[PDB]
Amino acid sequence: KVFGRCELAAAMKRHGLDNYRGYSLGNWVCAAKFESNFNTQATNRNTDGSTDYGILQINSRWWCNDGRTPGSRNLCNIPCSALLSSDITASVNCAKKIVSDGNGMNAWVAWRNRCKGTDVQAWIRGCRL
Numbered sequence: 822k823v824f825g826r827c828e829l830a831a832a833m834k835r836h837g838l839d840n841y842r843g844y845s846l847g848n849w850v851c852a853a854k855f856e857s858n859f860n861t862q863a864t865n866r867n868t869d870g871s872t873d874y875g876i877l878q879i880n881s882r883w884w885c886n887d888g889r890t891p892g893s894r895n896l897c898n899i900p901c902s903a904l905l906s907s908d909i910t911a912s913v914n915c916a917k918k919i920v921s922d923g924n925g926m927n928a929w930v931a932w933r934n935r936c937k938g939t940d941v942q943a944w945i946r947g948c949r950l
């Protein structure tokens with residue numbers, strides 16, 4: 822599923838991401854825009870052989886099981902395929918564990934490089950929330 826901007830903001834708010842660990846909703850929408858262009862089916866292969874999945878490009882190295890990432894963990898206790906669902910529950914619940922890991926949203930290199938320090942509230946401008 823490719824979300825609309827405000828559609829995804831509303832889904833992320835309903836799933837409790839707005840100000841989760843102090844990160845306003847615009848931060849999460851911004852991160853999803855640059856990770857996946859709001860496409861739940863986005864996948865990307867990393868140099869190390871791990872794969873990133875879903876709207877927030879969650880990595881198989883630590884967070885999900887894909888059966889093809891040697892020596893990896895599954896700390897969200899999910900198949901990586903659940904992160905591709907039209908239902909964002911699995912991506913949101915796993916993102917809450919990641920952002921709680923110590924480095925906040927710096928876990929998402931695209932958030933650090935494209936969202937951090939910017940006017941992220943622009944991403945939820947105009948939305949009914």
Ligand code: NA
Pocket residue numbers: 881882883884885886887890893894895
């Ligand atoms: Na894994």
